[PDB]
Amino acid sequence: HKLPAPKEIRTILDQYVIGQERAKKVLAVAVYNHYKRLNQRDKKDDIELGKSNILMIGPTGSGKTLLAETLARLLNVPFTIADATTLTEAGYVGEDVENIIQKLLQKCDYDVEKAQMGIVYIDEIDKISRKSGEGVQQALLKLIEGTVASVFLQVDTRNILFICGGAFAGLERVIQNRSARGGIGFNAEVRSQEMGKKVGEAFKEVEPEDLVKFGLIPEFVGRLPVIATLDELDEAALMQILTEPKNALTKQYAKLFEMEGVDLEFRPDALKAVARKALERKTGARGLRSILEGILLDTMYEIPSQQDVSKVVIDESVIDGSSQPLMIYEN
Amino acid sequence: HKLPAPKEIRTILDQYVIGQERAKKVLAVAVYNHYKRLNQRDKKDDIELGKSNILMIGPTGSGKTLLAETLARLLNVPFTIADATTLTEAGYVGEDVENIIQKLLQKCDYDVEKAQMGIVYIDEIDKISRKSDNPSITRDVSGEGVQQALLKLIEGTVASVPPQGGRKHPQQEFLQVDTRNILFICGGAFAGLERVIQNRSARGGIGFNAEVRSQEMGKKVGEAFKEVEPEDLVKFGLIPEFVGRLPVIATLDELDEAALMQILTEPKNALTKQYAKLFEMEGVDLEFRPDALKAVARKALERKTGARGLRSILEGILLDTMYEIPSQQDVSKVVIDESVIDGSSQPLMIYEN
Amino acid sequence: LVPMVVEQSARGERAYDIYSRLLKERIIFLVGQVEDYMANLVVAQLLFLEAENPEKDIHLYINSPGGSVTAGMSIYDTMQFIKPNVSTTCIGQACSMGALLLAGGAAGKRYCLPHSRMMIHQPLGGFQGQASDIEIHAKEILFIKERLNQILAHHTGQPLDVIARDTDRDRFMSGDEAVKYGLIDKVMTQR
Amino acid sequence: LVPMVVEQSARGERAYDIYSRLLKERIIFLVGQVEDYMANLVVAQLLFLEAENPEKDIHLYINSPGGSVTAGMSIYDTMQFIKPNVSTTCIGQACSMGALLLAGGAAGKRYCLPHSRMMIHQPLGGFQGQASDIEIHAKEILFIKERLNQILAHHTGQPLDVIARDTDRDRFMSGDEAVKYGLIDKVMTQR
Ligand SMILES: Nc1ncnc2c1ncn2[C@@H]1O[C@H](COP(=O)(O)OP(=O)(O)OP(=O)(O)O)[C@@H](O)[C@H]1O
Ligand SMILES: Nc1ncnc2c1ncn2[C@@H]1O[C@H](COP(=O)(O)OP(=O)(O)OP(=O)(O)O)[C@@H](O)[C@H]1O
Ligand SMILES: [Mg+2]
Ligand SMILES: [Mg+2]
Description:
The structure is cut from a larger assembly and holds two copies of chain A and two copies of chain C.
Chain A: H1 6-14, H2 21-39, E1 56-57, H3 64-73, E2 82-83, H4 99-108, H5 112-116, E3 122-123, H6 134-144, E4 165-166, H7 171-178, H8 208-214, H9 218-221, H10 235-241, H11 249-260, E5 263-266, H12 268-281, H13 284-299, E6 311-314, H14 316-320, E7 326-327
Parallel strand pairs in A: 1-4, 2-3, 5-6
Antiparallel strand pairs in A: 6-7
Chain C: E1 4-6, E2 15-17, H1 18-23, E3 27-31, H2 36-52, E4 58-64, H3 69-81, E5 86-94, H4 96-103, E6 110-112, E7 117-120, H5 131-156, H6 160-167, E8 171-173, H7 175-181, E9 186-187
Parallel strand pairs in C: 3-4, 4-5, 5-6, 5-7, 6-9
Antiparallel strand pairs in C: 1-2, 7-8
Bound molecules: adenosine-5'-triphosphate (2 copies) and magnesium ion (2 copies).
C-alpha cells in the first residue's frame, strides 16, 4: 500500500485534477488513516474505530471517475472499479452480488496479500435507489459489513476501504427541504427565492439523516463515518482543462483538421466565451464538447469544400455566433 | 476508400430527402470525421478520438428514419438500424440488450473488428423516456432501466455476443467485440417536448407588461427543437447522465411550403410516380397537372401528420378512378387538376377514341 | 341569492356559482352603475381570460345606466390593448358609458337584442371652487368630451361633427337605427 | 360579487378568487380612497411577494382619487425599501397619492394606459383649535408639502421650483404630457 502523507496524496493528485482539491483534503487524510491505523493497530486501547469508509457524491461529469482513477493511478493495491446496476439478486434473476468480489480477483492477481488491502470502489451507486432495487442494497450492504465471502477463491473482506460514488439524482431537493426559509418582514433576512440554487445544496454540508430521507437503507447510510463533496466545475479550471489532457478537445480538434493538412489556429480570447457557454448549459466538462462540435460543424463543412485551406483563425466573434470562420486559404 | 468529404456524402442524401440540410450535414460531418478515426489508429498521441454521439430529434414525417435508410445504402461500413422498444433488460424475461450488436454481426459475417467499425442508429428513442421527470415507484424496466443498461455501452464496453454455432460448449467462446468504435446516432420523435421547451423558455404570466402566451397549441411544432437544451430533455424524462453521454443535438424543422410542393415529384421515389407506375401496368397514364401538386401540398398541412399524410390524400382522390379503370376500359389517360384535389371536381378521364 | 352550479367535468365534480361558471366560457358581466370597484373586476377578468386563451374571442354583456368616466376608460383601454377580440352584446339599456364600451367592441362582433335601447350623451360632471379652479376643470371635461367623440367616430365611422351634434342632447336609438349609425353590426333575433 | 377562478395546478385543482389569483403573479391592486386599512393590505402583499421571490418584479396598478398622506407614505417607503422593483401602471386616475405612487416606481417600469388622467396638487388638511395649536399643525402641513415635492423631483428629475409651482393649483396631465414631465417612462398602447 502506497500510504503517503495527506500532503503528498493531495499534491501528487492535484497534478491530474484541477478544482477538486477541497474534497481531496478530506479524502487525503481519510485514506491515510485507514491503511496506517488498521495495518498497525497494535491492539489500540478501547478499539471502536470502524473501517474509514468515505462516501463520494458528485453530479455527472464532475470527475468522479477521474478522482477514482487518479486515486488508483499510483495506488499499487487493487481498486476493482465496479458498478451497482449490474448487481441483481443473488443468482436468481441475473448477476449475483459476488461479482464485485470477482472484479477484485482480477485486479488482486489472485493474491490474498493484495486482496486484503483491496480498495473496493463502485460508481453510480444511485441507480439502485429503493422504489433490482432495495434488495440489491441489502445484499450489497452485507459485504460492506466485512463478511468474508468467496466468489471460487477465499477473499479477505475485512479492512476493505469503500470510496463508492454515485451521481444521486434529486439529492439537492431533499437537503433543500431540511434548509429553513426566510421570514416576511421589514427587519428580516429573506435570503433567496430558493436555497439550493446558488451553491450545490448537496455538496456543501451533509448529515446521514439527509441520505436516509433520499430513500436509501438506513444501515448503509450510517455505515460511512466520513463523507466528501465534489464541486461541479470552475470557470478558471475550464480554460486550463481545455488543453490540459494529452488529447484535449481543442487538441483533438486541431489534430482532426491536421489529418487533412489544415492548422486549427485558435485565439486565447475565444476561450473565455467558450467557458461561459458550457457554464450555461450546465452539463459538466463533457458538456463543452457539444458547444464546439456545433461551432466547428461550419468549419467541418468549409475546410473540406475549399482545398489548400492552410489554417483557420477563430476569434471571439465566432464563439459569439455572429462571425463566420475566417478562412486563411492561400497558395 | 478515399474518406468522402461531407459534400461527397450529402449529395446522395439530397437525392431523396427534401430540406433536411441541418441533419444531412450533421451526419455528413460526423460520418466524415468518423471514417478518419478508423484510419487514424496510429499511436501518435492521436488515439482518443472521442465521439460526440448525436441525438436526432424532430416531428414525425421529417425523414428521420428515411435518413438512416438512405445512409445505410451509402456507408461502406456495416450500418444497422435499431429500435429501443423491443430490447429489454436481460434479467427480466425477454430479448437481451446485446442482441442488437449481434444484428450488426449478422450483416458483418461476425467479423468483430469489422463490426466495431460499423455504426448503430436507434430510432424511437422517445419511448424509453422516463414515465415522469422523477422516477416512479414502479420500476420502468421497459424504459429507463434499458436506458442505463445501454448507457455503459455508449460510454464504451465490450460485448460477449455469441457465434453462429457451437451450442454444445457451455459458453461457446462468446465473441468479444468493442463498443467505443461503434458510433451511436439516436433518432426519435419527441412528442410533447414542444410544451416543455415552450414553458421552459417562457412561462406566460398575467398583466399588461407580461409574456402571455398561448396556453396549449400545436401551431408551434415548426422549428420547435431549435432552442431545446439538455435541461428540457431531463424534464421529458431523459435521465441527466444519459443526456450528457450524447453531446450533439440535431434539429429537424417540421416542413416547408417548397418541400411539400417538391416532394410529390422531385424525389427519386415519388408518391405520384408510385401510382403512375402501377397505373402503367394497368395500361393507363397518370398526368398530374402542376396545380394538382400544390393542392395536395396544402391538404397535407391540415392533417398535421407529416409527409405520410400526402399518401392518404392521393389515395382518397384516386379511389373511384382506381376502382373504375379495371372495369372501365378504353381509358387512355386520367388528367388531374387542382379542382379534383379540392374535391369540387371528379378526376378527368381521357379516352383515345 | 346566487345559485350554485356543477360542471361535471371529466376530472370530477366542482361547484361554481352562476357567474363564475360562465366566466370559464370567456363571458364577463357588466351590470349596474359603473364605478371603480366594479370596473376593476372587469379588468381583472379580461386579463385572466387573456392568459387562459389569447386567441379565443371574449364576450362582454352590457346592461348599465352609465357611471364614472374614468372607470369606463379603464375597461375600454384594456379591451383595445389586449390581443383577443372582445365581443359585445347589449341587453336591456346602454347609456353613455355603456354605449362607449359597446361601440368599442371588435368589428363585426357587436350585437344588441331586438328590444334594446342605446343612448349616447355627453359627460356629466360637477365641481365647486374658485374661478381659477372652475376654469381648469372646465377645460378637462371639455378635453374628455373631445376624446370620447373621437372614439365613437373611429368605431362608428361617422364624422366628428356628427358625433358632437348627436351627443349634445339625449338621443335614443333602437337596434336597427344603431346598425345604420355604426354603433353595432348585427341585431340578434333568434337562434 | 367577486368571481372564483381555478388554477388547475399539476399537483391538483385549487380555487382562488379573481384577486388572489392575480396576487400569485406579483400583482397588487390599489382601488378607492387611500386609507389605513386598505393601505395595510398593500404593505402586507408587498412583503409577502418579496419573500416568495425577492428578484422578480412586482406590478402595482393604481386607480385612486387620493386619500390619507400617512397611509400613502407607508406604501411608498415600503416600495423603495424592498429589493424587487415595483412597477406601476396607471389604469385611469391618480389625483394626489396615485401620482406619488405612480412616480415612485422603479425607473423604466412606470406605465400608463392611453386615456389615463394624472393630476398633482398640494396636500389638503383640516384642523381646528387654539392659535398655538394651529401654528404647530401649519408647520407640519408645510413640512409635508416640502417632503412630497422633493420625492417628485428625485424621480422626475425636474427642479423643486417647478414642482412647487405646478402643485399650487390642480394640474391635469395626459399620458404624452406626463412622459415629457418625467412622471412616467412609457405609454402602453398595444401588446
Ligand atoms: N475534474 C475534472 N478535470 C478535468 N476533466 C474533467 C473533470 N471532470 C470531468 N472531466 C472531463 O470529462 C470527460 C470524462 O467524463 P467522465 O466519463 O469521467 O464523467 P464522470 O465524471 O465519470 O461522470 P459521473 O460523475 O456520472 O461518473 C473527460 O474528457 C474529462 O476531461
Ligand atoms: N424530408 C422528407 N423527404 C422525403 N420523404 C420524406 C421526408 N420526410 C418523410 N418522408 C416520407 O415519410 C416516410 C418516412 O417517415 P419518417 O422517417 O419521416 O418518420 P419518423 O419521423 O421516423 O417517425 P418516428 O419518429 O415515429 O419513427 C417515408 O416513406 C418518406 O418517403
Ligand atoms: Mg467517467
Ligand atoms: Mg419513422
